Structure formats: structure tokens, C-alpha cells
Amino acid sequence: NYYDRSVSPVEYAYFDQSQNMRAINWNKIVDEKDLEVWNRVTQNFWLPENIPVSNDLPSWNELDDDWQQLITRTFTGLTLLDTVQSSIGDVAQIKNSLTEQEQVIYANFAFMVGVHARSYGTIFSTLCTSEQIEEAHEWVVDNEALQARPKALIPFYTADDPLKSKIAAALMPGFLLYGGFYLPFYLSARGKLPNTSDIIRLILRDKVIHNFYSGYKYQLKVAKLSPEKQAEMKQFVFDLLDKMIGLEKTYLHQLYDGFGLADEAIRFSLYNAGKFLQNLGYESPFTKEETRIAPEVFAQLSA
Amino acid sequence: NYYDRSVSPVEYAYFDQSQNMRAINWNKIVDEKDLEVWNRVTQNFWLPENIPVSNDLPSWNELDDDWQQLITRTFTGLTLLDTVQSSIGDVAQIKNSLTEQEQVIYANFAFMVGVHARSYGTIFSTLCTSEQIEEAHEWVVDNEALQARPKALIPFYTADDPLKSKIAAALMPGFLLYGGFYLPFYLSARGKLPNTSDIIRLILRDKVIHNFYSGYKYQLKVAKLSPEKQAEMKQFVFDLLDKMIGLEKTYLHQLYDGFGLADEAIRFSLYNAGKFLQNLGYESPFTKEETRIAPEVFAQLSARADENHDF
Ligand SMILES: [Ca+2]
Ligand SMILES: [Ca+2]
Ligand SMILES: [Ca+2]
């Protein structure tokens, strides 16, 4: 068959030029799961302009300067993480794909995480002053605890280990932003910024698929490895997650300093750390007490 | 100001870690052209399943096996070029961006060229047999003239010269597929496969912007260079275009062998070669005779993409 004696262009470009290139074949596909994911993420296309964030103005005006600062800072920090994933992380997955369709799906992911980053700008334009916006950018650049998180993960994207790169690509949508996502749901549970929470739910509708898919592809690759190499990768995952949780806790304590929200946000974050691990085929070590989310906040998350 | 003492993440990842990272700022935009392009390409989002080509079945079934084969082969060849650009070319532009928004726009481009590639499969699903689809894939793999074209561009994407990479990224949507796009417009001008041409026009509505945008960013960067380096880059562009035209001519004569379409297709290609040069800030050397397109074909080429097909 033509497929078994040719390579996809990205394999030609970065791995092996010994055989000629094949065009993508969407009429005969290797993995049915790729078509399912492709259809879902493309049919879920959205842009921030179609949520009426202006209707949040009354409840925004109920919040003082400190709360408004917290929200702008929180969201600008999430914007940084999306900028990392759109511009580096998801595109780095393309060349390490198992299938042709997967290469196209990661292109979609990079674009949609771009749209996620863009959506915070829409919220800021609708609600924040230009000085609130600028202050939050200054704060993000100068917050070492914030910066430590992407600085720890970026090297996996730029190094030559596809499995470690894949783990980072799952960890970003699966875990790293949930500490910040706590804030809008905490607020909307109390009748504040309901339209902003609709944008957050559109973002999560994508991110849950991004985490699942990267975890799915990770599991396919690692299952081929020897038991010793499988154990080595598991050890790497739990060690990296442990480090990222340490960094996330430090950052969230700084972010929410004065508001009391950090310990709840950390539990919300750890619930998702467990989900991240589950999507890689591992068991969550975290207790029900460690991952406890208030019913009113969980209702916002799961709507 | 925070912006002037920080770097974007992709700059941090690949080039410069002397400063901390900044989040993309969509509230204070460096180049309003980026916002204009972002808004247009995102508003133009479409998916090929929304343009069913089941209504092409009557005119498709009129065509003999040779014409059906030609179309399947031509489109599978265009699918390869889209696969090259989606999986390698456009994403390679992200790290060489002048602005933050440009990084996100090239992510959009890579995705949408993926959609372009996807669209041919939806056409084949409706019109082609399993055997026709498989034969075309075999033919593309084994056709050296076809292969030579993306093989000439890929090295620029994987190498570390950003301007040469940018030129390649402009040449793909600006020039390399038009020799093949001649076929559906030749057909639809004769009342054949009209719905397929709607898909081609949706594809072109994106590709014209991809070419414009890469050409625009190229011009901004080369304007900063010394006159000597500008002269070096101009010579590279015309040299690369000359090479690509030679490779395209050889491929189109093989593709259209027995149909007589190759000389018209080559003129159609060279018209777009001129536009490619113009979008890079250079003058087209090609004569009116060399780039002559029939009005009935140009009518199909230039018709507005149907807004009803938008997502
Ligand atoms: Ca405003
Ligand atoms: Ca508390
Ligand atoms: Ca002729």
C-alpha cells in the first residue's frame, strides 16, 4: 500500500527523507478517535465577540478596585499560559503525531488556545480601564512565582523527547490554569460576572478535549515501551506534577493574598491534577478532602 | 513600559531568555493590520461539510474515467501541498513573528490550510470510488515532478533564515497551487462540477489573505535591511521563483498530458506568479500574453465566495 512506503510531510521535514511524501487521506483513516475529536473541536468553534460580556457591567461595578485588580491579574496570568501553549506547546506536538489527522488536530488546538487568550482581551476591553490592563501586564512580567510555571514546562517543548513534550502538552490544559479558573466560578456562584463565566465554560469545553487527546496519544505511545521504560515515564510524570503543584501553590497564595481564596483554589486545582493523571492512564493519589470543591462552585464548572 | 523589557513566550523559548515573559496584549496592539487580518480570517471560518457537492454528481457522472482520474489526481496533489503548509510551513512562521498577534494569526493559517486539505476528502467522499481515491494517492507518491515542488520549499521552513522561510510561506498560497486550481474553474466555466468550485473559492478567500499577509510581513522586515542585503533577498526571490516555475511547468505538462490544458494552466499559474511578486513589493516581469486567462475562467476565479457557506 502507498501509505506503508511514503511519509507525511512533517516526517519528511524533520525525520526521514528516504521516501516520498503522501497527501493526508481523510477517506481512509488509521484511528477513528481522530475523526471524533476533529469533528467535535471544529463544530465547537466560537469567538469571544458572541458572548455579551457588556451585561457583566453592573456586577463589575459592584466590585471594588482590589477585586477588579485581582480579576485582571488572574486573567492576564491565564493569558500568558495560553500564549505559551498556542505559540510553542501545541504546535510542537504536530511533528510527533502518530497519525496524519492528529497533525491537523494540533493545528486546531494551537489556534483555539489563541482564541482563549484573545477572549480575556475582549473581557478587559469591555470592563477594565487601560491602566488596570497595563498594571496587570506589569504584574505578570514581574511575578517570579507566576513565571516559574511556564519556565519549568517550556524546556520539554524545545527538547527532543516526544513523550515529555506530550506530558507538558497535557498538563497545561489539564491542570495549570484551574487555580485561576476558580475565581470566575467563585464569583458567578455569587451572581458576579455571569457572562464572563460563559466564556470560561467555552474555554473549558476545548481544554477538556485538549487534555483528553494529549493523554490518549501519550497512552498509545507508552504502551509500546518496555515495562522498565513505562515505569521510568510514570516516575517522571508524578515527579513533574509534584513540582508543578509546588509552584502552583506558591503562585496562588501570592495571587489571592488578602482575599482568602488560595486554599479553596488549590483544592480546585488538585481535583484537576487528579483528572490530568487519570487522562494519562494513572491513578489519582489525592484524597476527597484535598480536592473538595463547594457545590455552588462545582455547579458553575459543570454547567 | 513592561512590553519593552519583556519577551513573548516563543521568543523566550527559542531566542532570548534575558527577560521575563509577557502575555499577549490584545488591548494595545502594535500593528492594526494584524487586528484587521485576525478579524477577517476568523469571520471567514468555514467547514467543507457545509458545502455538499452531491449536486455535482450529474455533471461528474457525465465525465469519462480519464477526466475523473485527472480531477482526483490534481486535487490529491493540492491536498499534499496543503498538508505541507499546515503541518510545517505556517507553524514555522510563528517564532519569526514581528508582533504578538501575528503569532496567533499563523496558528489560524495552519489550521485553516488543514481545513483546505480536509475539503478535498469531502469532495472525494461524494464523487469518487475507493479505487480512484487510492490510485491518486499512489500517483502522488510516485510522481517525482509533483514531489520536487514541496521538496524545494521545505528546507527553507526547517532552516534558520527567517526571510527565506517567509518567502516560501508566501509562495505556497500565492503561486504553487494555481496550476491545479485552473482545472475546477475550467470545468465550472463549462457547467461541470459547479459546487466543487464554491469550495475552491472558499479556499482562495483564505489563501489570498495568507499570501498578502506573509508578503506584508516580508516587506516590513526587508525594509530594515541594508541596501546590499535587500539586493541579495530580491535576487533570491526571483531565483527561487524561476526554479519553482520550472518545476511547476514540468509537473503540469505531466498532470495534464493528453488533455491539452497544460499551456493554459501555465499561463494561469504565471498570472499568479506575478501577483506573488507584487505582494512581496517587486515588479512582475511577465507579459500579458504570458499570463492570459480566458474571461469565462477568470469569471470563476474572481467570483465572491458565497457567504451562505460561512460557519
Ligand atoms: Ca471599554
Ligand atoms: Ca479560604
Ligand atoms: Ca491548450
**Cα A182 → chain centroid:** 14
Find the helix or strand (DSSP H, E) in which A246 lies: helix A227-255
CA torsion A10-A151-B109-B248 (nearest 10°) is -40
**Cα B243 → chain centroid:** 18
C-alpha of residue A60 to centroid of ligand 1, in Å: 13
Q: Is the dihedral of CA B60, B65, B67, B71 positive or negative?
A: positive
Residues of B tagged active-site: 120
CA distances from A132 to A9, A137, B83, B155 (A): 46, 9, 43, 45
| Amino acid at site B135 | E
Find the helix or strand (DSSP H, E) in which B80 lies: helix B65-84
Give A147's contacts in chain B (Cβ within 8 Å): 20-21
Distance separating alpha carbons of residues B160 and B179, to the nearest angstrom: 29
Q: A232 CB contacts (<8 Å, ≥6 apart)?
A: none
Distance separating alpha carbons of residues A141 and A135, to the nearest angstrom: 10
Cell representation of residue B250: 514540468
Which residue of B lies nearest to A109 if distances are taken between CA atoms?
Answer: B111
Angle between helices B262-279 and B162-171 (to 10 degrees): 140
Reference B186, options B284, B71, B278; nearest CA is: B71
| Amino acid at site B299 | A
Which residue of B lies nearest to A74 if distances are taken between CA atoms?
Answer: B23
Q: B113 CB contacts (<8 Å, ≥6 apart)?
A: B82, B85, B86, B90, B173, B206, B210
Shortest-distance ligand to the CA of residue A253: 2
**A117 min Cα distance to partner chain B (Å):** 7
CA distances from B261 to B194, B215, B289 (A): 19, 30, 16
Give A12's contacts in chain B (Cβ within 8 Å): 154
Taking ligand 2, which is a single-atom ion, which protein residues have CB atoms under 5 Å away? A 260, 263
Give B156's contacts in chain A (Cβ within 8 Å): none
Q: Is the dihedral of CA B36, B28, A83, A57 positive or negative?
A: negative
DSSP letters, A48-81, are GGGS-GGGGHHHHHTS-HHHHHHHHHHHHHHHHH
Tell me which residue has cell 493528453.
B258
Alpha helices in chain B (DSSP H): 9-14, 32-43, 57-62, 65-84, 90-94, 100-127, 130-142, 144-158, 162-171, 178-189, 194-223, 227-255, 262-279, 295-302
Cell representation of residue B171: 509562495
- In 10 A of CB A263, how many CB atoms? 12
Give B134's contacts in chain A (Cβ within 8 Å): 2, 28
Tell me which residue has cell 514546562.
A153
B16: alpha, beta or left, given left = phi > 0 and alpha = psi -120 to 50? beta
C-alpha distance across the termini of chain B, in Å:
40
Cell representation of residue B111: 489550521
Find the helix or strand (DSSP H, E) in which A20 lies: none
Contact between residue B21 and residue A147 where contact means Cβ atoms under 8 Å apart? yes
Q: B191 CB contacts (<8 Å, ≥6 apart)?
A: B59
Technique of determination: X-ray
Compute the 3-state secondary structure of chain A and give helix, strand, coil in percent, each to the nearest 5.
75, 0, 20
Q: A149 CB contacts (<8 Å, ≥6 apart)?
A: A81, A176, A244, A247, A248, A251
CB contact A4 to B (< 8 Å): no
Task: Name the 3-class secondary structure at A21.
Answer: strand
Q: Is the dihedral of CA B295, B298, B304, B308 positive or negative?
A: positive
**A275 min Cα distance to partner chain B (Å):** 27
Cell representation of residue A203: 474555554
CA distances from B10 to A114, B17, B98, B206 (A): 13, 10, 11, 25
**B30 min Cα distance to partner chain A (Å):** 14
Tell me which residue has cell 483544592.
A267
Contact between residue A164 and residue A229 where contact means Cβ atoms under 8 Å apart? no
CA distances from B241 to A122, B126, B285 (A): 41, 36, 12
Tell me the structure's resolution in angstroms, rounded to a single decimal.
1.6
A8/B154 CB distance under 8 A: no
Contact between residue B3 and residue B100 where contact means Cβ atoms under 8 Å apart? no
Domains of chain B plus CATH, in order, are: 1-311 (1.10.620.20)
CB contact A99 to B (< 8 Å): no
Contact between residue B42 and residue B58 where contact means Cβ atoms under 8 Å apart? no
Distance separating alpha carbons of residues A180 and A196, to the nearest angstrom: 13
Contact between residue A182 and residue A268 where contact means Cβ atoms under 8 Å apart? yes
Count of alpha carbons within 13 Å of A247, Cβ hemisphere only? 20
Q: Which residue of B5, B6, B22, B27 is the best one to mutate when testing the A interface, meaning the one whose CB has the most A CBs within 10 A?
A: B27
Count residue pairs from A and B with Cβ separation < 8 A.
204
Distance separating alpha carbons of residues A48 and A82, to the nearest angstrom: 15
Distance separating alpha carbons of residues A87 and A77, to the nearest angstrom: 16
Angle CA(A178)–CA(A295)–CA(A282) in degrees, nearest 5? 50
Distance separating alpha carbons of residues B202 and A135, to the nearest angstrom: 42
